Symmetry: C3
Subunit: 164 residues, 3 copies
Amino acid sequence: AHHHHHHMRIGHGYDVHRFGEGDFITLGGVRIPHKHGLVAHSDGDVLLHALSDALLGAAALGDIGKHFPDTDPRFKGADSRALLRHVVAIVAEKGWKVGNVDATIVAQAPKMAPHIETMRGLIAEDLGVAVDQVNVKATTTERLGFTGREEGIAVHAVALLMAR
Amino acid sequence: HHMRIGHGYDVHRFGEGDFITLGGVRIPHKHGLVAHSDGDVLLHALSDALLGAAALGDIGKHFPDTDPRFKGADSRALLRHVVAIVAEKGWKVGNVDATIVAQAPKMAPHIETMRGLIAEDLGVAVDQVNVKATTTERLGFTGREEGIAVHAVALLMAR
Amino acid sequence: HMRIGHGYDVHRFGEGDFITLGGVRIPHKHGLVAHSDGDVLLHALSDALLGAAALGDIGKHFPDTDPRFKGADSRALLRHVVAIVAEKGWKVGNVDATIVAQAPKMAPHIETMRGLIAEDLGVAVDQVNVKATTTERLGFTGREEGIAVHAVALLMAR
Ligand SMILES: Nc1ccn([C@@H]2O[C@H](COP(=O)(O)O)[C@@H](O)[C@H]2O)c(=O)n1
Ligand SMILES: Nc1ccn([C@@H]2O[C@H](COP(=O)(O)O)[C@@H](O)[C@H]2O)c(=O)n1
Ligand SMILES: Nc1ccn([C@@H]2O[C@H](COP(=O)(O)O)[C@@H](O)[C@H]2O)c(=O)n1
Ligand SMILES: [Mg+2]
Ligand SMILES: [Mg+2]
Ligand SMILES: [Mg+2]
């Protein structure tokens, strides 16, 4: 008796990748044509990485690197949707499911708007939730800072977890 | 008892003008803020935190800068609309917390005024609203006084 | 009932041979410039707690104009924040923080930070998350001009 119930947890992820050569970027599982790619060991999906770290952070499980180190061949080159699904499983094992997530793509270019709803659908599938539990938005910094100078893209993500 | 989290981040550049508007307060200043609306970075970030928590997108979806009807819009009115459509979806405000990231002007004399206006627009008590301000120690675009940034977070509760 | 808060703090590097983060002394080619001991991480956590509780920010409670707090241990400042948040009726549910720094390497120090933070917050270690990341040499953190921290907190009614 007298156990904890209906507990909730907050997490926040902030990720950055710099532009490099390529013909597209990948955000939220969606390939977006662009004259640069993002520099990364795999697909450079800044949005899914930030969401992953928000989930792990809420669960006090560290960050992606703690669970998928580069020394581990299993996850070498892994698709970031597959990584996110593995994060969801780890967090579930610890007793937590997703209540909702909200994320902000900080990018001067390309435009994110036409891709947002597709991202929401894929993220919701990977998180095991309804689309109404997932929000993605975007903003520029009005040509200020490293995102404004088109040097890279940043994402802020927050997550609220609920006890399973 | 269900709840939702949201986060908003907004930036506006300085431009010509004699005041800025933050949290509904007009602060005399050497520059204004450039924006389609009145440029209230703080109310924009709060609006996006609320829309984000309710999975309703962002303020640019609801009040596009391609629509001249929203030119110079009072961001308090935009925020009140956000509160209304969040309520329609079944949520009210639990609490909000925001950080103004600005090298200048000093926000301190205006914080409590901002809290009262924000609480009124959100339909909550002043104790459910926190506003704070910080500098970046003259680093980065806010430190060079190129613009102002705001981070806001919101927790929604079931109506 | 629960409450959300967020803190963001930045300090610039200055001449020195260590920094203090999460209560831990980390050797470095520079120090951090600050009125206090410069612990960006504890400052951001303090502001997330105060923000959630609608108690303002840490400068309201420990003004930089007061010489008595010059060089102050940011853990002691945090312990006071925890006490006044409790007096208002709130305790910590969990916190999550991100150190944004190109250097020094934070990884060897994180578990030590979590232990000190959890003690100061009056919670278990499994209620405290700290992670570190770079901006891939972009921006003022990428140019090694300073360190930033983002922290979020969820408070629970006492
Ligand atoms: N890279 C970006 C940046 C912003 N946007 C969208 O543009 C609108 C206005 O953004 P700004 O306020 O940054 O101009 C928002 O609705 C935002 O989601 C976008 O679709 N792609
Ligand atoms: N633009 C700003 C920036 C900070 N401040 C206040 O100054 C104090 C210290 O902030 P800094 O250490 O960032 O200078 C804080 O309490 C903050 O509320 C302000 O009143 N206006
Ligand atoms: N200042 C820093 C930045 C990152 N890190 C470590 O580097 C890992 C990967 O971070 P980046 O992707 O930012 O390089 C983190 O999970 C953390 O263990 C660190 O230990 N100190
Ligand atoms: Mg990444
Ligand atoms: Mg705006
Ligand atoms: Mg500080």
